[PDB]
């Protein structure tokens, strides 16, 4: 996992000019498996996958997440070590007996922004919207149900090779179509996945947009001024404060997103739309979304919600049909990234891995919180010593050996 941290103040004193940002890097074990007899069996799986108590910090630096040169200069040794370790075996003494270890690396705790920045793809506002398939933003507003995972590390390297060498000697747009939007050399081999937290945040923000559009009844008035939309948003915020006891926040977070997705929320919102058909539309929309969410948000969907898993394709097709039929005023020729991903890639993801919510990047954010706490109250107040102290204290805090001394009741 990895993420950039803004709003990290700089101290006085001597040393180089440190930027006002921060970037972390951590890892977490998931499941240990032994090959006994003729099959495999797990020995120790993480009970709390997104807990902060198992997010072991590895690297810490104070640099911009967009400073590509410095970022690569810092992270190249770690990637070299990872590549060297991906084809070796470890001998280790456990209880006085040598043991054998072999690793399988998987990097999923990367938000889409950093995935795009590292894998050498284009920005989020690009026409090639997905990071798993090769569709554009236009077809992503027509099909919605038939796609397949195609992107891969080796394919990205080959694409970049083609982009640099230009064998066929074609134009810039033809070469872009041939490369599918690659303009940089990847340097971190990752796997195609979906961050659950950011997906939920984007979905909740888009729903909020849909609600504040439906209040104004835009489905019959295609023209609207600027103050009208602001008024509409203010009315929605006041109604939410009055009914749902929620606070109007400027930037979408997780708790607001969780409290927003509820049937009675839509019921309260229906007090603002004089129509009747749009009420049915919104209610069926929220019902489909809440029936779909546990498929990609639960810990183990194969056991906690098999009905939602087996009945997912029909629900997704009905969701796309409802978007194309009743919400034609907005979803004709454009669609967000997470809608496409959720509707056209997650069944293969569960069938290939088994879960998504366990591979999220929540623990990384809790580690960012612990970092903000430690840097301020558990470090030496000096540029030369603060990061070492924070790293050591966080490594000590993450250690499970010290945590075992706390469950002294059982």
């Amino acid at each position: 996992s990895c993420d950039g941290m803004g709003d990290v103040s700089e101290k006085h004193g001597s040393g180089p000019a440190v930027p006002e940002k921060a970037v972390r890097f951590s890892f977490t074990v998931m499941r240990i498996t032994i090959e006994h007899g003729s099959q495999n069996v797990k020995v120790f799986e993480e009970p709390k996958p997104n807990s902060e108590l198992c997010c072991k910090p590895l690297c810490l630096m104070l640099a911009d997440e967009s400073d590509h040169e410095t970022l690569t200069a810092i992270l190249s040794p770690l990637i070299a070590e990872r590549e060297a370790m991906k084809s070796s075996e470890l001998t280790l003494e456990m209880g006085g007996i040598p043991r054998t270890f072999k690793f399988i690396f998987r990097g999923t705790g990367y938000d889409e922004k950093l995935v795009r920045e590292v894998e050498g793809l284009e920005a989020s506002g690009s026409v090639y919207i997905c990071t798993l398939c090769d569709t554009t933003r236009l077809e992503a507003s027509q099909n919605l149900v038939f796609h397949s995972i195609t992107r891969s590390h080796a394919e990205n390297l080959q694409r970049y090779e083609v982009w640099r060498s230009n064998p066929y000697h074609e134009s810039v747009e033809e070469l872009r179509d041939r490369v599918k939007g690659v303009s940089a050399k990847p340097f971190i081999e990752t796997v195609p996945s979906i961050d659950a937290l950011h997906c939920d945040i984007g979905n909740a923000a888009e729903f909020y947009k849909i609600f504040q559009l439906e209040i104004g009844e835009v489905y019959k008035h295609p023209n609207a001024s600027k103050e009208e939309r602001k008024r509409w948003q203010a009315t929605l915020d006041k109604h939410l404060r009055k009914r749902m006891n929620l606070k109007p926040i400027m930037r979408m977070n997780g708790n607001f997103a969780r409290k927003l997705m509820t049937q009675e929320t839509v019921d309260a919102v229906c007090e603002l739309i004089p129509s009747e058909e749009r009420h049915e539309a919104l209610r069926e929309l929220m019902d489909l979304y809440l029936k779909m969410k546990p498929v990609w948000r639960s810990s183990c969907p194969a056991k906690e919600c098999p009905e939602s898993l087996c009945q997912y394709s029909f629900n997704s097709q009905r969701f796309a049909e409802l978007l194309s039929t009743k919400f034609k005023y907005r979803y004709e020729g454009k669609i967000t990234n997470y809608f496409h991903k959720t509707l056209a890639h997650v069944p293969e993801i569960i069938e290939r891995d088994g879960s998504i919510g366990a591979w999220a990047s929540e623990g990384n954010q809790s580690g960012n919180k612990l970092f903000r706490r430690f840097r301020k109250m558990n470090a030496r107040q000096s540029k030369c010593y603060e990061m070492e102290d924070v790293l050591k204290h966080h490594w000590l805090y993450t250690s499970k050996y010290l945590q075992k001394f706390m469950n002294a009741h059982n």
Partner: protein
Amino acid sequence: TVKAITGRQIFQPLHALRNAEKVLLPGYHPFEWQPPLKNVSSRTDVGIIDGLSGLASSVDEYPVDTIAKRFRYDSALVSALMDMEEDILEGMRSQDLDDYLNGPFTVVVKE
């Protein structure tokens, strides 16, 4: 953790501390003003009085959108003076003064 490992109670449970807190907090020691305080109740067990002071919050009245908490001023002064008993006693003993004296002490407070 300490109780389960060491098999004894080096520390006290939470309810004991809660019960002990009620001595340092205001509204626990008796006192009285020889000149009665005008427009101030003489009761001496009030704790955290509401900050709004019974402000009218009806729909016709001027709207209220603030919350506040506070103590009684005189009770707070009594509690603060009772907190510094040992210091005043040691000051009187060190300045060559008999402790049983009950002269009209003068107190200066910075707000």
